[PDB]
Amino acid sequence: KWTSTAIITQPDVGQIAGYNNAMNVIYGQAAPKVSDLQETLIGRFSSAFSALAETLDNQEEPEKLTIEPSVKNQQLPLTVSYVGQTAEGAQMKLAQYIQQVDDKVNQELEKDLKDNIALGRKNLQDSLRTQEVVAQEQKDLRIRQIQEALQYANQAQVTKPQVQQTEDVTQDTLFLLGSEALESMIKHEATRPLVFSPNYYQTRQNLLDIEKLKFDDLDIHAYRYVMKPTLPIRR
Amino acid sequence: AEKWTSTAIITQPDVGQIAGYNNAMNVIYGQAAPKVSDLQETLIGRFSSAFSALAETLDNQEEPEKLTIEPSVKNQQLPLTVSYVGQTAEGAQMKLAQYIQQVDDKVNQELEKDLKDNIALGRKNLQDSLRTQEVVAQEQKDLRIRQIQEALQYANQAQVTKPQVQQTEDVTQDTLFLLGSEALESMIKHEATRPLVFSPNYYQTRQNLLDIEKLKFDDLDIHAYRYVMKPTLPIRRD
Amino acid sequence: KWTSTAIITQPDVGQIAGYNNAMNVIYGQAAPKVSDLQETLIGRFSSAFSALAETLDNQKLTIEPSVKNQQLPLTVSYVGQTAEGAQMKLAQYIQQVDDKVNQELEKDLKDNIALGRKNLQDSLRTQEVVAQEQKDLRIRQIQEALQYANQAQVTKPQVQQTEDVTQDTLFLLGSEALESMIKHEATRPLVFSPNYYQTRQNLLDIEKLKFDDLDIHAYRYVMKPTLPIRRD
Ligand SMILES: [Mg+2]
Ligand SMILES: [Mg+2]
């Protein structure tokens, strides 16, 4: 029997640059810290590796595949080993299993990214919705204010404007525009498109940018090699 | 040894698995909602809590059962290796699968109650916010009406009935009487229908409160864990 | 020697609904997140629990994470003379620690309501003094304005733009109107900003915080103290 060992750890910032750049488009200032993404990716690799190790052992011809921390009081790196029938085999078989686990995690991350895109899209559409509700409630308040001013202008018998149309009118001074013009305003303000702040148009643009994201455009790795599978020794 | 161990590997649920629960928390707390990652940790924390309680109870029997939960890899928090030692291979697998489902059902009942408590807290916080904001809007309106009532005394003495101005920006306690006693009387007479002025936060808060009432517990497809590996059918004894 | 065990974790949102609400009433948008309160309360429970065990070790009582490398839940145990005794002594000690953590928080909350109550009532008093001083300045200005308006023989308003009326051109209003302002000065309302009305409302809400209604737990039971069937 022959033992090949390798040392794996979380992927580099450069390896996850794209994945990190996608999470920033989806969540913005709420995007996970680059270090948190690295921990999640190696967590998912470690998970799938343990499942392979437990399955390889539960066979008619069991295969010993291991995973343990390389350093005593440290979470990472991880030492992964395989026991093969030949020296060529133990080393290749360990390298194949590491690649097999990576391919499974890559399929999992593709699904996870789609779920993250959906949540981000939901958060942005919900933002557009509340902003639309406040724009509509603001428009209705203005109409409501002109309708009350029209009542004052009717009692004060103000038909023609007294004020030379001020862009800064108020609930109190509105009646000075006269019945005539206030009736016209209750029409114009009712058909007036909703007024949004730039944040609305930015949220709109953030939503289009999420649509522009692709999984294929990101070469995402769930691990990094510290040491590649070693040439085995007789054991 | 005449004992068979079935093993399973569990971890925190996927983002997709808890998309509903996370949305509920966002509807209830808004910007104060827990991060999606924090929800995942809490849910798996809750699953392993209930699992550990089952394991401690299964050991405290006339015929003790060994049900174990531990991190799969040393020094890692997740994933978790759950295992059970049965009388047969088919038995150990079914008994572990049943116990995992039993813990999940208990956790699910707990989360249903917790969600109801969360919807109550969120509602009370938003209701308190609208209340406070309505009083300030109403107190602001009453101040203006008392100012108008005062100004009407100044207009009655100066015998100002019709408006005296041809270009107004905004009026103060001093300048209000220039609108004339006729307009001022009209404003007091219709003070009841004068609309309250609120900030956008009020309209947002009011909408958040309606959306909380839209939340359903059965509509959430929530599970507290994810299987990495389902309970194994052991080939050989332990 | 029988060991009774229990599994404890952070309290539920429902369990600390009262504590969280009082923090929200006192701090508003600066209040701690409900999840942060849960972590703090269980942190306080474990620390008081370890403190009790340490004092008990000075003449048995243990606290440790249930699952290796998971901060929560926590496994607590006690070794008693009987299974029935071990169970009751663990339950009593858990309740004892809970009462101590609850008493420390009751006291902390009272300190917080006092400081808040102080800060808000100082804010209202400052604002009331400024509103009254502003009103008095304006009345002095109106009285001075009336003297000029009498001399300039300006009785009816001479204002075509409200923009023309400043604290130095009040005489533009009627001498008739300025007399009316001085005559009805006592009923001229004090002008406060919305912040005053908000502050006042916040003060009433803090004063509505009653300890008679609230009851909070620094922990939740995952598993109650076991009745051990065998010695160990
Ligand atoms: Mg005159
Ligand atoms: Mg005043």
B4-11 and B226-229: which strand pairing? antiparallel
Amino acid at A136: Q
Q: How was this structure determined?
A: X-ray
**Gap from CA of A171 to ligand 2 centroid (Å):** 20
Breaks in chain B after residues, C-to-N cutoff 2.5 Å: none
Contact B10, B27 (CB under 8 A): no
Taking every pair of C-alpha atoms in chain A, what is the biggest distance, in angstroms? 108
Separation CA C26–CA C108 (nearest Å): 12
What angle in degrees, to the nearest 10, is found between the helix axes of B19-29 and B89-158? 20
Resolution in A: 2.5
Instruction: Compute the count of residue pairs across chains B and C with CB atoms less than 8 Å apart.
Output: 176
Segment 82-141 of chain B within 8 Å of chain A by CB: none
Closest residue of chain B to A151, computed from CA coordinates: B186
* Residue found by looking up tokens 């390889």 in the block: A56
Distances (CA, A) of A31 to A21, A215, B35, B189, C36: 9, 17, 10, 55, 20
Contact B10, B96 (CB under 8 A): no
Contact A156, B163 (CB under 8 A): yes
Segment 203-232 of chain C within 8 Å of chain B by CB: 205, 222-223, 226-229
Residue A138: closest CA among B212, B209, B204, B27: B204
Q: Say if the Cβ atoms of B229 and A32 lie within 8 Å.
A: no
Q: How many domains does chain C have?
A: 1
- Touching C: which chains, 3+ CB pairs < 8 A? B
Burial of A55 (0-12, 13-18, 19+ CB in 10 A): middle
Dihedral of the alpha carbons of B167, B169, B175, B178, in degrees to the nearest 10: 30
**Gap from CA of B141 to ligand 2 centroid (Å):** 15
DSSP, collapsed to helix, strand or coil, labels residue B71 as: strand
Separation CA A201–CA A218 (nearest Å): 28
Indicate which CATH number applies to the domain containing B13.
3.30.1890.10
Q: Which residues of B touch C160 (CB under 8 A)?
A: 164-167
Residues 6+ apart with CB under 8 A from C139: C181, C182, C185, C188
Residue A172: closest CA among A139, A148, A189, A138: A148
Breaks in chain C after residues, C-to-N cutoff 2.5 Å: 59
Instruction: Name which of B18, B22, B75, B174 to mutate to probe chain A: the one with the most chain A Cβ atoms within 10 A of its Cβ.
Output: B75
Please compute, for residue B110, the number of CA atoms within 13 A of its CA located in the half-sphere on the CB side.
Answer: 22
CA distance A148 to chain B (A): 7
The DSSP 8-state label assigned to residue B162 in this structure reads S
Backbone angles phi, psi at C187, to 5 degrees: -90, 0
Contact B24, B215 (CB under 8 A): yes
Residues of the domain holding C35: 1-232
Alpha-carbon torsion B43, B47, B48, B50, what sign?
positive
